Structure formats: structure tokens, C-alpha cells
Design a protein around this ligand. Sequence first.
Ligand code: ADN
Ligand code: CL
Length: 301
Amino acid sequence: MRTYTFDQVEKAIEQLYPDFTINTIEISGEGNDCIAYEINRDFIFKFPKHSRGSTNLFNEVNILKRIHNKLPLPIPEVVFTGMPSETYQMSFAGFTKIKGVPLTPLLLNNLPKQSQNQAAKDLARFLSELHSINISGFKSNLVLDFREKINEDNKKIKKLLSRELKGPQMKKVDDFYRDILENEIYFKYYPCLIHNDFSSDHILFDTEKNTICGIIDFGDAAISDPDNDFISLMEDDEEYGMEFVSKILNHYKHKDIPTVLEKYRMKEKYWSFEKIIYGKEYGYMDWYEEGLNEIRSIKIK
Ligand SMILES: Nc1ncnc2c1ncn2[C@@H]1O[C@H](CO)[C@@H](O)[C@H]1O
Ligand SMILES: [Cl-]
């Protein structure tokens, strides 16, 4: 992973946009892929920590352009873009800053009921529109076929762990994957554009009006199961929990809530495997070793 000096950030931007005066530059936050810099309190510029992150940033730029002006909450607008090199598909990008603070579960549960309900309705409406966007222009690098993802994961896990697990432990890994694969419910969805990291840290809130004022972080958006964007809201402490999320599902007119729950339960168990792979694909040994220990020692449905 690479980090950046403030000077490097300013030089990179100067190279392609020499007429843009930078007065203020501060780190705004940081995810798996990118470090974010707030520039002139007007813009957020993302700089990739690594190649994989850069490809995600390239995709985020492409998606945000394709959906500009289509959705009923504000989303970042692409204003500046960097260049490809032998290392990065895109060396940086600058988006409009969306104002607001994350709608944390704490903040949400302290709102008056009327604003909680309005927030659930505004989310459903946003997701209905997002999930309705015409996907036919989106190439295969943006398509995340869940069955292919599960089979490809099964193969990455075997390749990574065949020297790390004993016989019965790998047996339990095969039983687990066989069980998921034989359940049709995970695989029969109508593919749609999904945010795919749809959680409270990415939902921005205006406390003067008590209304959601933006959705951010599209670097994982992909063509996939629309249910992914309800399950990412559901974790009982970390996120909103079921009472709130069923108001979103009801506003969205979801026809099959129990399927949403079943997907959520499966994704809870699936986390150990995600941790191994993420471990290696994003260079986080801590996750790797945590996921390995869980496969080694603990029951998995
Ligand atoms: N366009 C934006 N407007 C407001 N905050 C942003 C924006 N983009 C990124 N951020 C912040 O920097 C982090 C990493 O992208 C985000 O989760 C958020 O904290
Ligand atoms: Cl469209």
C-alpha cells in the first residue's frame, strides 16, 4: 500500500490541471482502495493505495458518469480525472464534495419518528431508481454473477489453503460450498446495478433539515443481486437492524422479505472465506489469519 504526501497530491493535480488553484488540502477519510483528500472544501479527490484500488476507482469514475443525474439523492459528480500508468488504471479522480455526516445508527435512532420514516422512504426510492438503471451498456468487468463468484471463490480458497488445512477441515469447506451452490435462492435474481457497499458510513445526512443529503463511495458498484443493498444495512449493531430496514423494504415494495433474511444469514457465515480472500487480494494478513483460525476451529453451517 502506498501513501501520499500533500505535495505529491498537489503536483499530480497541477500536472493535468495547471489552472486549478489549491488553497486547502486535508485527508478526508480512507477506505480499502483509496485515500480521500478534501480540496478547497469543494472537492474530494481519491488517490489509490494500490493497483487493485486503482481499478475500483476507474470503475467508480465510469459508473458515476453513466448515472449522473439519474438518481433522486445527490451523488458525487466526476470533475477531475488522472491518467493510466503501468501501475494504476487511474492515478486519481476528483469528485464534487457531498456535504453531510454519515447517518450512524445512533444518529438515526435519535431522530423524531417522522424523520426516521422519511429516511427509510428516501433510501427505498433511491435504491428503486438505482436498481432500475439500464444495465445493457455495462461490460463484464462490472458484472458480478453470484454463482460464478461463489465457484471462483471456492477455487481461490482451495488454492490458498490446500497446504493450510487438514482433511476434515477442508471437507467442511467443500460441504459448506456444496450447500450454498445447491440452494437456488442465492442465484435466481434479476441482475441490476447495485451500490454494493450500501451502509451507514456511505449515507450522508443533513442535520439542519434532518434529511439524507447524499450517497457516496461507488467503488464496489457492480451488476448483481439487488438484495445485496438491503443486507448491507441489516447488521444488528454495526448497521441499522431489521425494524428500520423492513420500512425500506416495504417502501421499495419488496415481494420476498424472507429471501432477503436468508441471504443475510448466509452472508454472515460466508464472512470467514471473504476474510481469507480479502486477506490476500487486498494484502491484509490480519483478516487472513482471523479467517484461517475460524475455518480451523469453528462450525460453519
Ligand atoms: N464525494 C464525497 N463527499 C463527501 N465525503 C466523501 C466523498 N467521497 C468520499 N468521502 C469521504 O472519504 C471516505 C473514503 O472514500 C468516504 O467514506 C467519506 O468519509
Ligand atoms: Cl438508464
